[PDB]
Amino acid sequence: TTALVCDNGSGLVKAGFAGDDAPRAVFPSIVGYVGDEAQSKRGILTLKYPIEHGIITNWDDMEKIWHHTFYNELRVAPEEHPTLLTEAPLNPKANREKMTQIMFETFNVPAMYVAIQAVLSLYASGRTTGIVLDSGDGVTHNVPIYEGYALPHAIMRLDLAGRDLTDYLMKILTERGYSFVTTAEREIVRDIKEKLCYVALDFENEMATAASSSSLEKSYELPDGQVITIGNERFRCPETLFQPSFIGMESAGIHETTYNSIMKCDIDIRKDLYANNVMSGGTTMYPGIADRMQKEITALAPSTMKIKIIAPPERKYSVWIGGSILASLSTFQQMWITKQEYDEAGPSIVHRKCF
């Protein structure tokens, strides 16, 4: 009897079996047809995002995503699999109850549990104490955890992630004359973002370097054969993570939200949080983002503070991997809500077992 791990992301669903080292199903969280089957017949229906900024808003489209996960992607009978779901930090109590309601009444799972995404990434990094920087497609979070328990009052939220970074790269790529408009071209911009972008150590010195020589220029061959050249757009795109003003957002950068999130904790544990900055999410994959985060946090912290940035090589799935590890432990599954307990208490039991 294998447990199911489904990471409901704002842009990508990560699903698979507990005990595996990687999710077996990764598809976009888009409804139309769902995912790859919907991006093909895109000129017929409208594509909506059921999970914008990490919170599930429309439950009918979410039900379609979960149905697509169980039957079309993983090809499993939901009635024969305990299922572990993930949620964004500070998830409302009602939104947790609806997840339990759909899992038991619509899919009839024998057991269910909803876990915090950032806590799974910390466990996946082999830690019980630390502050997680989870930057995915729709939302970016700073979540401190001490000895296995998250600190909700210090959690920072920033509605700026990979989706906005893709659009900002699309915008600045027009300066060189390129035009990426169609839905197919937006996937090419995402590919350019994931392949050639990087975080500058000193932004102003790289801006002057890009204007001084052509050593930072990179070439990229489009599917139609056209070869384009990209310059300072490589590091101007992920710079929005540290300067949200690049897209007109009056918010603090990821380095400041991390620093602020630490300051909202007890002084005894700040020393441990500075040495355990765990990065999670696909938007934390830019080369050089750890060195830049190291440089910015050092400038904000006391001079004697030992600071360490942890960037796991597969932090793109660290949320799911931590779920696969925890769901492989029998004592963890013991806390899961069984179908009998749901049939007795109802949907409010998610707040009595899931933490």
């Binding site: 000895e147 296995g148 590890i325 432990l329 013991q334 933490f355």
Partner: protein, 140 residues
Amino acid sequence: TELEKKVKLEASQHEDAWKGAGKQVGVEIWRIQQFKVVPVPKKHHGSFYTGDSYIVLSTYHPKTNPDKLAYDVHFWLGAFTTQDEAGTAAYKTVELDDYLGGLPVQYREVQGYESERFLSLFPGLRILDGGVETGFHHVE
């Protein structure tokens, strides 16, 4: 939070590795073996495999009372341990912490950078090559 402690404590009762732990002053050692907490034989205490993750429970007498028991729980991460073994050791450390009523203080030890509190548990500490195979199933 008081109901959270109730279910976390009830969950820790289903691990046989904690039955009898922290009962007397000493050092108890477990090794993570394919998502399972396996006790390390006494003859092998102090020898840790560079590719595995361990849980080390140090029961001692606190300075504030020589007739009482305090706990220092350390999970030791080998330089070549896999993600499953390190993550299970981290979670099970919190689980043993809850099993003993939150009293244990948690320490994260990595090979070659262990704290003085952890090194003091051995007169002594020998690192061995190899380790138990990962519990992960590889996805091609």
